[PDB]
Design an enzyme around this catalytic site. Structure first.
Site, PDB file in Angstrom:
ATOM      1  N   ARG B  70     -22.973  48.281   1.038  1.00 31.37           N
ATOM      2  CA  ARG B  70     -22.227  49.381   0.447  1.00 31.37           C
ATOM      3  C   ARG B  70     -23.234  50.219  -0.334  1.00 31.37           C
ATOM      4  NH1 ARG B  70     -19.621  49.686  -4.925  1.00 31.37           N
ATOM      5  NH2 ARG B  70     -18.119  51.433  -4.925  1.00 31.37           N
ATOM      6  N   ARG B 117     -14.993  65.478 -15.729  1.00 32.65           N
ATOM      7  CA  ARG B 117     -16.128  65.245 -16.614  1.00 32.65           C
ATOM      8  C   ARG B 117     -16.030  66.090 -17.872  1.00 32.65           C
ATOM      9  NH1 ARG B 117     -19.389  60.806 -15.605  1.00 32.65           N
ATOM     10  NH2 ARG B 117     -19.458  60.467 -13.318  1.00 32.65           N
ATOM     11  N   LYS B 260      -9.671  54.475  -0.802  1.00 34.69           N
ATOM     12  CA  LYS B 260      -9.612  53.810  -2.107  1.00 34.69           C
ATOM     13  C   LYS B 260      -8.424  54.282  -2.936  1.00 34.69           C
ATOM     14  CE  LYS B 260     -13.705  53.633  -4.163  1.00 34.69           C
ATOM     15  NZ  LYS B 260     -14.820  54.497  -4.810  1.00 34.69           N
ATOM     16  N   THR B 318     -14.091  44.764  -7.062  1.00 35.17           N
ATOM     17  CA  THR B 318     -14.461  45.142  -8.425  1.00 35.17           C
ATOM     18  C   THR B 318     -14.189  43.978  -9.384  1.00 35.17           C
ATOM     19  OG1 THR B 318     -14.081  47.506  -7.968  1.00 35.17           O
ATOM     20  CG2 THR B 318     -14.210  46.829 -10.315  1.00 35.17           C
TER      21      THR B 318
END
Lengths: 414, 516, 479, 514
Positions: B70, B117, B260, B318
């Site tokens: 990955r 952000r 995802k 994760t």
């Protein structure tokens, strides 16, 4: 519509998973007990009041470290924090005290353990977590050391090594219960095999109707950090789905920096997981694999559980002196909460070991006609259900008593 | 049956548990002394980073069990990843010299993705609890950041967070709750705020596009370098994955897209996303910030079950072995997590910082390999097959009908393997969906499909290199023989074993065959 | 030892297929026979002394077939039954109530020695080999005779008798007869040819205000009744599968499909269902039944039927008492052969949730009885409703039903598993003692009839007070 | 259609609740019908009408009739069958049902047609002393079975004349057995005796049975219905009379008494199949118990994958009437739902006035009943109970019926030489018609013993290469399927063959119809 109810009515377990909804809020109150370990981070009376409020049900005293004088201070602070909620009979939350033996550390039954067990009897602990049990004889030796004065104390055997796993059935037979002690277990057998031991013991203890505890590193990272990892929340939730009666904090509450947050997080995970149990399969399989019985209390308990499912009862109110009748309802894992009204302060503390059971210490003196006395205890149970949320007027409730506990009554709440 | 296979055979890989009449009794019969002898079939995804970029590390990792490499494009230059791809291929191709043992390794590109952000500060400042911070999208503050003023590069934030909504900053470290919308907010949890930090809006319908301008460049790099798979970040609806598929374009037509699912909207629009996707990643990292941490397990279990039922690959990701970033042995919660992703039904499990930057990358791959192998054997196949049959739609698809007959056949005889010939992967995927205990050995001439079927639990891809035979029956028979002799060498197959062979004249023929 | 009797090894088999493989001809059916038997009254069974033999052999319900006979005939039928029933009443622990069902003539069509019809119908008011009189003028036809055995241009040979039944794939008479039944106190009406809900309402109307307590069982006899079954079931107290006319009105080979459907849906609705006609037909002339006939009886019980019926076997044939004895022996063996594990589990799932405390207590008591192999569930009921909610979850233990209502005692024979016991003592001041005495009457009666035994366990089902629900369940050891 | 909604229900109860008298069956009828051949069904023209109504197996009852008489029945049967050559043509099997060992009373003082009455409560002496062979009266009964005196004990029972008289042994002594009449009646001369619950040590074969099995072999029958089978060694005796290979004949063991019911498993292990012989069972055990014996035996036979016949009085009243009773149609339907592979007629076809109608009626009932089977549960339970197998032919079979259930296939086309391949599919009870293509004329007759198997006789000589020869036989199955309504364009069908000639049946293929 809520408490994963659409997933509850699936026709297969596959489809039950598919119907799990992150927006279906748990409504029932949390039924898996939380055992917290006491240490520098959780010893002051004020910290303990917080932990109770967060959901601690059982206080673990780890006798690997700390002198008799140290643990006597711990016990007094726990009692002080508890009694500071004894304003009213219905607001009192019992908290049990479990003594976890040192055992054969290295840095039959040790002379240190005999002294510690006599200390715990002398101070009235409810539960002994007996380290490193390998065979029935070891349980027998702990009971002898507790003596006639420790007769009502429950022995939860710690399975920590290969021998104890392989002799599990003889160990469980003579035990009140089991702890899956993953810490030493995962050094003593290959780390990758522990989940197999864990699932086998939880399943066997569920079948036998004896409590089982899952232990060690469930939220480890929260010793230093304020949120746990994704593996840790998964592990708590799966312990509940396996069948665990209790879940445990060690370093997280005994020494870490967020002990109260750790208790809150186990409480939050346990309640989501209880709602996600597929009771439909669980109840059919316990019925089916459980043998015919002629114990009137067992027969009434399974009858009450069937009737509770039938009307989506909010609660089963059970009158119990030893805890036994509440333990036999807990075994069938109702969705309704089991409200156990008892006059025994020790049984009130010990029934926390049993999933789904909320103890109620009754304090009023007896009534001359037993049927009046029964009715008062039952109304006491109803009042605490209303107060605590999960009894609305209009609900149906199941009542379980004697007249053995051998009567089951169906009652709608006015 | 003992007469042929011995007594020991029926004590291994949890066969006493496999045959219980209830799930409860199957749990009571699990046995830590029943050794898991079948080969490990859940694939392992390992993220590349400084701990794992050297060619010699990567060979160790391949031997340890890594199946999918990955690349996480959240960081690193295109140059940097091109050297990742190159070292991976060099390590993988160092085993080509013996085709019977060569393990294909897939390369997957995990996108940076649409992002929110903060700006640059006036360095570091500290947001202290209780205090009041302004949250602005006025361009005058892109560079004027202070401990009471935060700029964000997402103009429509002012419209998607309502009063009292929450705003998360720097991996949910900092938290804010809205008070006024003109967004004036109060620090809920405070802390250090750096510059250009990431933002999360739990529960919000954010209208960012399906991919970002940098994703379009990154996807074009990936096609040009021949990556097998995209993990597409932050997928919330079907139009998001259609946009990733347009960016790949024709040159990238056969790249698999694994969406995802990271946030509340994505969980609720799951069905429409899974339908246009090749598969799913349960991205628990971001999902534990975007929904309550204690509900991630519900989302995990729901998504795996629905992918299982659809027959599409599903990755668990994760923090599976997070502590192994610094320690050589994992926690008890961490081994439990891996085992229960497999028992839940996951096709793949993943490592991020455990392999990208930690002290023990090879060991973490070894650990996932060992747990998976144990958990696969504890699967209650009886109940799983029955339920998949009891729910799965009757099929008029000849290849799917063959698939279910061959898995049932394999269960009837304790087959050591189903050997299937496939060119796209599709026949092996249909077998994988019914979750045989038997290994699905997939013999293919497509190098890329061989890499890609690693996404499917139970499939071991083998790359056949020989040119055609004149008679199609002898080329078929040569390809089965390559699978048998590969299988004997790798320890999947022994003389005397039975196997089910699945081939085309659709792949609509199954054959029962004895080995040697 | 105890696990050899009552097909107990079959009862604990993990699958239906393995339950069948465990059936055992040496496992003796010890539990009392719980499927009720309906015996049609006729010359072979109307005398008081025959009625006594039938009652001793197992007759629970006496059917009056109002297709034949005068009102004076049937009133002496009723009085003869009542006299035979009450000759056992000096022994109240053994006394067996017996109900009386009136079966209406309905819209029968009939024709006017014998003659061979070889392989002309008039309604002009003397039949012969080429003319047949019918009492239905309005033939509607663009025709079957005598239980379908003869078939027929002019408005499949065989011998034509007289007054034979005719098939064409509420009368004023019916109304006098329903009112007759109310005057004479019948417990039940079997209402011929029901095709829709309106048909039942018309019956309940001709029954009037004195007859509100009478149960109405709708006879399903043709294609329409089968199609509108749900509607009919909703408003009826229960159903009879009248296979006789049904097997002429639809093809003979389809009757079993209709029978298994109606029984299943009646089990699901918790309403009683009767299986009727030709079950032991050869016993009309023979002292023993065929293999097909004992099979039919047994499978009717296996299907879910609450009652089974004899017609000509007891009304006109030469072995009426033997026919009752034979339905009894078969039902006893079939009852023990039921696979309750699957049946109870599917009854749970398919069945609604309920807030009714009586329904909720009832399912708890059946779960409790299954868990301890209870010999009996002792229930107090005045209307029979509590007993019927116990019966719909199909326990293996006998439901011993103690009541003061003589009508309810008779009417609960319709519910499989319920044995009615009539209690006669006037109350006591205290609910508590009145309850305990009725329970104890149930225990003593059950000991005497061979239903209970020292060492057995029983479930006792009663109410906390006198106006409320039946909401107490008690586990009790026999001593 | 085909009760498909009830097929789809999630429970058995719901399945029952969804059955529909207007859901018409479409599939071909799969449960075979055995007809007993006698005076009402001996003529060639009658047998033709009976093959058209649906007879699959002609039964000859050797309890009555000479070898010449049965030889002639066989020739007419075969002539009627051969008349349909030039084919759409139904194979018909021939079964020999043996007389069996019997026990009989002697002659009474009054002679052959005399009668005497045994009064309830009296004392009756049962004797084997041959000086009473012709002297029987009300207190003395002679029987031709010397060892009765040591196999019926005090408390035991002796039944006479088809169960009508019952005697309870009270005392055993050198004069014989002192009984008390429990059930009285009119006793005649030379009446059949049954010894309920006895271990009867008569042999497996009577003298008459040895001559009849020799006749069976010489005239080439497919099946023996062997009477009064109590134990495995009774089967071994039947098999020795038939020789080492048994000439291919199938031995269907008749379970008729208590010993045989209780020694069922050892009997089934060594038999090719079973007949539930309810006629005699009902004399030998209480009539109300016979449905228990039947349901156990059919269940166990399904488990083992061996054929089970339900027999006797299924449509009795049709001996004189043209329409059966409601209990008889129900009995036929319930033998099918029970799981019976085959059903039977005796007097209904052998001597009654409506033999074609009786065959027609079993046909119509079986079709309806077969659509009403609850395959979901039945298939699931046959899978869980059937053990693991490393036999390639059996592995392919379960793979094939699971594939057939996945796609609602119209049929499974199997190539079989002995019938075994077809019997391994049949034991999983597929909804799909099993179409068995065989070159063996005797396997085509014999696969009628298996429910849902339709035989097709292939007469073409073998191709040079196996793969061609297989495809031609498969093609024959397709084209016959179409013609006979089994399958149609649009269907899927499963094809079960072998990789090599002379090897296992180890290949399964899924095909769309064109």
């Amino acid at each position: 519509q809520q408490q994963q109810l659409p997933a509850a009515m699936a026709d297969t377990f596959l489809e039950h998973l598919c119907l799990l909804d992150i927006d279906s809020e748990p409504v029932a109150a949390r039924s898996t007990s939380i055992i917290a370990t006491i240490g520098p981070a959780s010893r002051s009376v004020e910290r303990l009041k917080e932990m109770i409020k967060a959901g601690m049900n059982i206080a673990r005293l780890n006798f690997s470290h700390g002198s008799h004088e140290y643990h006597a201070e711990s016990i007094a602070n726990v009692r002080e924090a508890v009694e500071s909620f004894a304003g009213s009979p219905l607001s009192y939350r019992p908290v049990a005290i479990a003594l976890d033996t040192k055992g054969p550390e290295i840095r039959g039954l040790s002379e240190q353990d005999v002294r510690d067990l006599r200390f715990g009897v002398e101070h009235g602990v409810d539960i002994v977590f007996a380290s490193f049990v390998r065979k029935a004889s070891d349980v027998a030796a702990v009971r002898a050391a507790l003596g006639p004065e420790g007769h009502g104390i429950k022995i939860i055997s710690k399975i920590e090594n290969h021998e104890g796993v392989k002799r599990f059935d003889e160990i469980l037979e003579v035990s009140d219960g089991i702890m899956v002690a993953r810490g030493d277990l995962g050094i003593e057998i290959p780390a990758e095999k522990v989940f197999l031991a864990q699932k086998m013991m939880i399943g066997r203890c569920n079948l036998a109707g004896k409590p089982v505890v899952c232990a060690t590193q469930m939220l480890e990272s929260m010793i230093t950090k304020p949120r746990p990892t994704r593996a840790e929340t998964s592990d708590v939730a799966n312990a509940v789905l396996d069948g665990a009666d209790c879940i445990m904090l060690s370093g997280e509450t005994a020494k870490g920096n967020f002990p109260v947050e750790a208790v809150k997080m186990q409480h939050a995970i346990a309640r989501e997981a209880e709602a996600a149990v597929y009771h439909r399969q669980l109840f059919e399989e316990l019925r089916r694999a459980a043998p015919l019985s002629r114990d009137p209390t067992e027969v009434t308990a399974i009858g009450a559980v069937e009737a509770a499912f039938k009307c989506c009862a909010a609660a089963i109110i059970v009158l119990t002196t030893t805890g036994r009748s509440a333990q036999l309802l807990s075994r069938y894992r109702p969705r309704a909460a089991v409200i156990a009204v008892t006059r025994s302060a020790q049984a009130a503390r010990q029934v926390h070991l049993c999933r789904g059971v909320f103890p109620l210490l009754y304090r009023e003196p007896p009534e001359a006609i037993w049927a009046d006395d029964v009715d008062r205890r039952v109304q006491f149970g109803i009042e605490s259900g209303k107060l605590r949320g999960f009894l609305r007027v209009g609900d149906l409730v199941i009542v379980v008593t004697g007249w053995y506990t051998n009567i089951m009554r169906v009652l709608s709440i006015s």
